[PDB]
Amino acid sequence: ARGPKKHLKRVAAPKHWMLDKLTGVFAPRPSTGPHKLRECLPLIIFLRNRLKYALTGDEVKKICMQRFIKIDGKVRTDITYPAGFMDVISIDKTGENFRLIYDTKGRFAVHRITPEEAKYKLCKVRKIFVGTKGIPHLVTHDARTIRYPDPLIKVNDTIQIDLETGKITDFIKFDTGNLCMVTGGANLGRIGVITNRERHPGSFDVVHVKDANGNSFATRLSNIFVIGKGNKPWISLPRGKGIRLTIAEERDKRLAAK
Template identity: 70%
Template sequence: MGRGPNLNTSDSEKHNSKLGAPSLTLLVLHRKKHQKRLSAPSHWLLDKLSGAYAPRPSPGPHKLRDCMPLIVFIRNRLKYALNSRETKAIVMQRLIKVDGKVRTDTTYPAGFMDVISIEKTGENFRLVYDTKGRFTVHRITAEEAEYKLAKVKRVQLGKNGIPFLVLHDARTIRYPDPAIKVNDTVKIDLSTGKISEFIRFDTAVIAMATGGRNMGRVGVITHRERHDGGFNIVHIKDAMDNSFATRETNVFVIGNEKPWISLPKGKGVKLSIAEERDRRRAYAIAGH
């Protein structure tokens, strides 16, 4: 019997090996540059039938699943542009600022607590979640646009023993107040980039859930549960005296007795389906 063909090696690989070219397995190690529309994050609120692809966020301070590209915010939310070409014309005029810095990348990843400013129209927005876990177009005043809140993710010593902390938006701040610990919230002055105040992560403070099924809900921390080898649980009670629990990593402190930021419509109180129905009916009756 004759020797059969080698099924493990394709003709193209044989040809490349003769020419001394690299194998095909070495040519696929590059960053993905495309994002299919169906697999895009649902909180972008993109419809399925407007194309096969969605804008892929550039590498930046926020993760792909936790951010919103500027093109989605400008074109799909604010309706200031009809297509990608018009959006690029807007950002290339240096009209859009994120946290006080001009951004000319249409796919720059803006994330939770970021301040987006449009000087030409005098508008300022802060990216926060609604009770359904979606980024909402939340307009803020010029005074509130001068600062942002950030959660402390890591505190450690760097080179030459210099203390520094890392925030949820990838900022690194050297020589912080020694009293600031992990999970605390700091208030950042966007003009200087320095910490002006901070809030301890403790009971009786106001917090927002930034992950899980309760994303976007706001309430007062009642107590915390520690689970060694597992996830620490935080219990929160909202303004309607409804209690819910979430992981400690999903809790973002936003104030002591009062929130340090203005909250979107609903004030972080999640309504049941029946309550939402009754509210819609009341609005409809009042409108007539």
């Protein structure tokens, strides 16, 4: 069609939001921002559907327009603003801080953090370039362009940024025997340790990840995010420890709890 699309049909929305069929015809339609439309989360969904604070669409803008909600220590009134992976949502009214981490089954989970941990965030560097009198530059997965990076930071490494400033505190290299998390494909939300990468020139690089419970799986390089140094994570994990336990013991656990 002519020009860009403005709407989004409800059934055409990405599955990990878990919008039901009958509520309406349209969906939230995440607006342009740091994270991709397919792999983000509108605040209207997070507030209304996940935290169960707002009932209707009006209550969400009535919350947001009173400027009670910050994303990465910055006030956002846009109810369809895309907050994606590693983004820290802060409610300073009720003093509640959330980090958006994918759960085992492959969706953003309502994972609370201490206010002391809502100071920094981890970020995967997309590229590294230099320009105009050679001040080198870095670009990350949440589109934060940072000047004068540490020259030890190469492409596909992770960096820890203080949210109040815009400067790198510490960084993790992408090497063998490092804790990573999958952010795309069948294995989305699984945490594990790198074993090796198999470089395919002129094509996608494939990496092999071993889980804590002896489960080994492969994934594309683009869908990898280093979260810890060695085996120890630099952030809190969700309810489960990123362990994909199968339907058999899912049933056994559920029936055991009953």
